[PDB]
Amino acid sequence: LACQEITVPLCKGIGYEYTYMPNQFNHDTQDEAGLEVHQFWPLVEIQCSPDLKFFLCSMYTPICLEDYKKPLPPCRSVCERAKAGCAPLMRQYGFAWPDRMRCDRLPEQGNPDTLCMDYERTLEVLFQG
């Protein structure tokens, strides 16, 4: 579970530099993760949410920190903003918000027992409850 430089094009320049495999989807390589995340590219191009790119990468190329050796998922707020912007459009064309992307299964900000990832304005990563 060593850190490796992110090489998925969608996730290059996302605000953190390294990821790790396997991810929560059981993808063994970034090549495998990159292939599946490619499916979302029309929404990325349409730009239904400024949060979609960050959210997808936090799942497919989860952040890897040299001084923190546990999964650091995105905050529920990140999922909720991406779903707000893009899920109505996805539903219009027969796509449900993916089950593996259910927002209530992600840790809340300010939760004492977990750490989760968000960002603010250039993109600076913020760690939160």
Domain residue spans of the chain = 1-129
Experimental method of this PDB entry: X-ray
Q: What dihedral angle (degrees, nearest 10) is formed by the CA atoms of 36, 42, 43, 48?
A: 170
Å resolution of this model?
2.3
**Residues annotated in a binding site for hexadecanoate:** 39-46
Please answer whether residues 57 and 65 qualify as being in contact, where contact means their C-beta atoms are separated by less than 8 angstroms.
no
Contacts for 39 with CB less than 8 Å, ≥ 6 apart: none
- Distance between CA atoms of residues 106 and 93, nearest Å: 26
Measured between alpha carbons, how far is 109 from 75 in angstroms, rounded to an integer?
6
- Residues forming the annotated binding site? 39-46
